Amino acid sequence: SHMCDAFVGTWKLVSSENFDDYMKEVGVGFATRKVAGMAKPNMIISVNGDVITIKSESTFKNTEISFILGQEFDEVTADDRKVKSTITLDGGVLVHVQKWDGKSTTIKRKREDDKLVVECVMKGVTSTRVYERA
Ligand SMILES: CCSC1=NC(=O)CC(=O)N1C1CCCCC1
Ligand SMILES: CCSC1=NC(=O)CC(=O)N1C1CCCCC1
Hints:
Blueprint: E1 9-17, H1 19-26, H2 30-38, E2 42-48, E3 51-57, E4 62-67, E5 73-76, E6 82-90, E7 93-100, E8 103-112, E9 115-122, E10 125-133
The structure holds 1-cyclohexyl-2-(ethylsulfanyl)pyrimidine-4,6(1H,5H)-dione (WGL) (2 copies).
The site of one 1-cyclohexyl-2-(ethylsulfanyl)pyrimidine-4,6(1H,5H)-dione (WGL) has 14 residues, from strand 3 and strand 4.
């Protein structure tokens, strides 16, 4: 058993704010922003030993990352950036940093009440996305 337990399960998007703006900041093109912004993903978090898996399933894309906390990995994002990612647990929050082309973005995932809150930041543009158990 582990503190990451609080994240495990199947989650459904219930609200999004400022995500088109965040995606613009990151450099996502118009057509991708439109189609990804329409997506209503289900997000499946699981843990097997030290390996955490986060899967997103939507009509836009079905993606998945697996990782060990603190240990860099290379990720291809749904908008086709090739980034170096590191995810750590800080004070109960999963902190995901992606670095590419001298740029960086941080994605925080946290449990608040019965929700899983996703906060995405690029420069000083923040987007908040709220998920509930499916
Ligand atoms: C735009 C949909 S993708 C997505 N959306 C979210 O709001 C949270 C989340 O973590 N993901 C992905 C990221 C890549 C790994 C699998 C999950
Ligand atoms: C909520 C995290 S956003 C995110 N995280 C990733 O780890 C991969 C990825 O592809 N994305 C975005 C990128 C913009 C297009 C929509 C998905």
